[model samples]
Target chain A: SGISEVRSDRDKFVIFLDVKHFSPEDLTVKVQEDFVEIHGKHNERQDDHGYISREFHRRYRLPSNVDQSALSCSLSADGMLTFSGPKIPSGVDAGHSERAIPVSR
Target chain B: SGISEVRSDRDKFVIFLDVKHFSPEDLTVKVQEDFVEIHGKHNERQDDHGYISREFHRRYRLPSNVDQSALSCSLSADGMLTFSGPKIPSGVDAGHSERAIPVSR
Candidate 1:
């Protein structure tokens, strides 16, 4: 129904989302400070109305332990996406930055 | 947010769904009479609580013009699924058989 989160140094923190209707070409992810924003879109041609479209967006705040410097993301063959990065063990959260994250199919 | 349906003799009927969290291997479809039933499932391992799983199901009554004998389905690279088949030009609605339908990736 919503996003899925699971994290532990016993494991790398993983974030999951079901974005099936939108293609990989239609999805974008951006990181700002400690939060990540995702957007997806699709369009349909109407018989007489010219065009119709739908869009969805979601955002998530990263945990303090997550390493902001490096990250990994993948979109499954069926649109299940998982994003994760290494955990900073016993370290203070010390960065404020922004960038566009790359997503892989 | 919900299933997408677009149909007209101007085109073959198409059904769309976002079953991202579930794999093509995790989904099944059954046809009975003029209706189709779909089911999908996924499982996760817990720290100490053993295994946990999630499931979803959706069903739709096909349009009378849809030809059931040779339906087709495909799942996208990111989990958007589309199901469709050729339309019966002009025929009587007179079938009530049951069968398992094949899905393609």
Candidate 2:
């Protein structure tokens, strides 16, 4: 569906997303000084019926409270993305922002 | 990103989709007299950071040339869905169509 987030709960920043038509390995995570951008390469593939191209990408602003040193991103056995990181002291809800991620057709 | 299909080539119908945040087992296929509806279940869970819910679904018209007896749906090791079905005799492209499938957060 859409991106899901767990703000300052348990002193950590957690985010979730569906990695459809993409492998967990294909996804890349960037730790910027300000924001974290997760992206994947879209591969145009042939379907038996017509045409299909598969790709997905999303972006999120890093809250000051998030401890970038321990930040980690992973996908489950299914196509589930679980981005986990401990929050630094003084977490703020206002700093955490997310953007609309489009799955290219 | 979106649904992809290979029409009337090699005398078969092949469709591809990414099943993100969902298990291959969670997917169910319905072979209707006119259309095939594929759906999955979404679960609401608490992420270490916030709230997270996961699910996906899609639909496609059944080409008359598709052989009902041999139609099969499968998922590759990595979240890739390969829907394979042999077309029936005298397949018509005009009757094959697809609708947009949305994922609910």
Candidate 3:
């Protein structure tokens, strides 16, 4: 399994995942109120030599100030997956302070 | 730092490196008759909150049957680096058999 990183800008929270040799069709993304789940499987034949297969599953806890409904997922041609969601309005009081959440592979 | 994989088809040898958040200009590739080296540095500021920076250097030994003149490198939009080289002609007596080479990151 590979590692991932999370970053936030003024309006969007972005999550980057290293998913080499994986295509967009091979990934599944689930976004909920408190967490986001990413699952990917790469099962393909590599010419006449042999086959290469790999699977990875990871879940990330989102801050309470994120808008889950605005989440989007995209896969790059080089096999990097990105999940982005809009942050809640700055004026709205989420009743909690922002904090870091531990993430694992 | 991240792991990389190497694959060979009938005509070309391909190396895939996981380089999330790295741009093509931040990478340097060196190719020789016996080895291929990849060095990358990512030193970018991540918005007003903080900054993120990383560096990686890796070397891969190439099989003797590879044609060093035909080597090429390309980077994907999502930060995957690939090095490809054509295999030498089958009948040529390079005087060596194919073997796996250990790569390090």
Candidate 4:
């Protein structure tokens, strides 16, 4: 895990990450230039005869509101990547935020 | 966090833990004497005036069938502790097994 954006709301924050086909093994994340960079490869133990080996890398961007200050990440045996942060601020209507910004000509 | 008993049912194993008031921070687990020991304390940033601090420890016996080889745990910002192991074996008939385990007393 690496640095992430911390968008403050009234009393809580929401953490979001945009990733695709993110394998739960060997995942690394870092923040740069206001965006998070995810990089890692998945590999398993090589067989006795070296019959097969699987490995792959992935990259993605971390969504806004991800708190880089207090980010804690861990992996489980079942291969699930779980992330939890402060609760999303309440009372900030999601729909209202999408309104167009007025331009002063 | 700690070694646990592995009880094979069919293809998977079930992991169980008996703990009380487990905090998300400072958690450590270890397996010993056919059971898993849980230990840890909860503490937050101390104020400038040295006002207050909270800490506690917990211990318990782990149920059978927890795969110690692939144990993984992580704490999220929301203070949730998640531990995952290999999937619990399927096709397990808990009732039938209980009836057959009659002691030869």
Candidate 5:
């Protein structure tokens, strides 16, 4: 339930997840018909000085016009997780609509 | 407050600030002798559908061996604020040491 946002460009929809300090191997992303779920855990020891550990789960609603089968994910060096889905061609409903999920952080 | 971390390699000390969804123009960074402060605001309206607004302040302590005058900053496309300061030459002491600040997110 970290921070998440959704934005659309001319041809694709992008979702941004704030997952700083999390390595690529720590995350799991799943794309469904109407939403995408992201879950991860960060557990690293700080040289016995200290440790920062966190677990989070977040869901981002997908627009009906997006092609879920084409969804892709990438984790940036700065610890941002991005999920991108291409938009379906115009005049095609994809048989769904917009819906919002209650998000908790 | 937001998440922050400090790391160092053989040549430099780096500070990472988790500031997702924030544009470069929205941030202010201040570097002092022993610490760096980052503050930012994210206030973008989401197509009149909703808005995600957040205000954060974080302070990262600098290693005494770092050259404050040579510090640099960059904001990545994924909204990570990084500050890098070169390490001072060995044996100089620079008259300082390492310290940790209480971080909040």
Candidate 6:
């Protein structure tokens, strides 16, 4: 219904994870340097109610060209994980030489 | 080197495109019912400068689980494309069933 805002610096990526189906207290989340893990449990069992208990794990590898020393992560109110790291230096420009050759007769 | 921001809703996922080394006029962008395309061109030349001109295309498929009637996109000042769409309905409750049986062994 509202805007999905992304707040980031030059070296980070911010993504939101929505857990609207379950309350935060009913779920356990663990974040590591490479991946985030989530586990959920059922609190009650009503006559017409069914509980969904599941464990989810996602792993990510850092880019080889990036500076791993400058990596950090933060969580948002909606369960979004923002990961920041140093940007890779673009080496499009360096030393170069240009020569003009005459056309063959 | 600051941040990577992602804007998404229950149905849409938004990503940012950073063209720090190029201008908007030197690029072409297209948005269709299923994809977004981008093209770039070089405009200047210097003795020690090398121009980088390339085309980038990204295609996205709208999921059948979401409502396609409510989709929108926008571009930011930093050359980011934001897409917004309808959220999918949570079917966690509708699939619940209640049953009771006596256990005798």
RMSD per candidate (Å) reads 22.2, 22.8, 20.9, 19.9, 21.4, 18.8
TM-score per candidate: 0.39, 0.38, 0.40, 0.29, 0.39, 0.30
Strongest candidate by TM-score: 3
- TM-score, candidate 6, is 0.30
When just chain B is superposed on the true chain B, each candidate scores a TM-score of: 0.71, 0.68, 0.74, 0.45, 0.71, 0.45
In order, the first chain's TM-score in every candidate is 0.70, 0.68, 0.73, 0.41, 0.72, 0.40
What stretches of model 1 exceed 4 Å from their correct place? A1-105, B1-9, B90-105
Q: What is the lDDT of candidate 6?
A: 0.45
How well does candidate 5 match the true structure in TM-score terms?
0.39
Q: Which residue pairs collide in model 6, if any? A: A9-B2, A9-B3, A10-B1, A10-B2, A10-B3, A11-B1, A11-B2, A12-A84, A12-B4
lDDT of 5 by residue, B1-105 (tens): 356777898799987777776766678888655767777887867886998888988877878888776777876666677778799777654323421111111
Candidate models: Cα lDDT each: 0.65, 0.63, 0.71, 0.42, 0.70, 0.45
TM-score (chain B) for model 2? 0.68
Q: If both were scored by lDDT, which would come out higher, candidate 5 or candidate 6? A: 5
Model 4: per-residue lDDT, tens digit, A41-93? 54445568553344443333334554455444443343433333343345565
Give the poorly placed runs of model 4, Cα more than 4 Å off: A1-105, B1-25, B44-48, B87-105
Q: Which ten residues in a row have the lowest lDDT in candidate 6 chain A?
A: A96-105
For model 2, what is the alpha-carbon lDDT of residue A69? 76
**lDDT computed for candidate 3:** 0.71
DockQ of 4: 0.01
| lDDT (C-alpha) at residue A41 in model 1 | 89
Q: What is candidate 3's lDDT per residue for B27-93, written digit by digit as tens?
A: 8888754888778898977889898989999888887787887677776655677788899877763
| Residue-wise C-alpha lDDT for candidate 1, range A28-70, written one tens digit per residue | 7777777767777888788987987879887777777777766
Residue B105 in candidate 6, Cα distance off native in Å: 70
Off by over 4 Å in 3: A1-105, B47-49, B92-105
